[PDB]
């Protein structure tokens, strides 16, 4: 059976899964339970970072990952870690 209570949560707001049509812009809102920590993002295949073809907007304890290059091939599994706590969400692409 499942446990009783989870460990110290480090994600104030988990980036719930979203849906975006191929080509359409897709952003994920992820808030950490602590400030100062650098929330690292990763996609199904390679890691994600604030650079071309992608976008990362961090502000204190908030982290929003913007992905405009998202397409029919992005219909995999999204992963995002923030120091110790690790969470991953699914991105359902629309056709």
Q: What is the CATH number of the domain that holds 25?
A: 2.60.40.10
Structural domain tally of the chain?
1
Where b means 16+ CB within 10 Å and e means fewer, 74-83 reads: bbeebbbbbe
Domain extent for 33: 1-95
The number of beta carbons lying within 10 Å of the beta carbon of residue 95 is 6
For residues 34 and 61, the answer to whether their CB atoms sit within 8 Å is yes
Rounded distance between C-alpha atoms, residue 47 and residue 7, angstroms: 26
Q: Cβ neighbours of residue 74 under 8 Å, at least 6 residues apart?
A: 26, 43, 44, 67, 91, 93
Q: What technique was this entry resolved by?
A: NMR
Closest among 68, 44, 45 to 55, alpha carbons compared: 68
Rounded distance between C-alpha atoms, residue 7 and residue 50, angstroms: 30
For residues 22 and 71, the answer to whether their CB atoms sit within 8 Å is yes
């Amino acid at each position: 059976p499942e446990p009783g209570k989870k460990p110290v949560s480090a994600f104030s707001k988990k980036p719930r899964s979203v849906e975006v049509a191929a080509g359409s812009p897709a952003v994920f809102e992820a808030e950490t339970e602590r400030a100062g920590v650098k929330v690292r993002w990763q996609r199904g295949g390679s890691d994600i970072s604030a650079s071309n073809k992608y976008g990362l907007a961090t502000e204190g304890t908030r982290h929003t990952l913007t992905v405009r290059e998202v397409g029919p091939a992005d219909q995999g599994s999204y992963a995002v870690i923030a120091g110790s706590s690790k969470v991953k969400f699914d991105l359902k692409v629309i056709e």
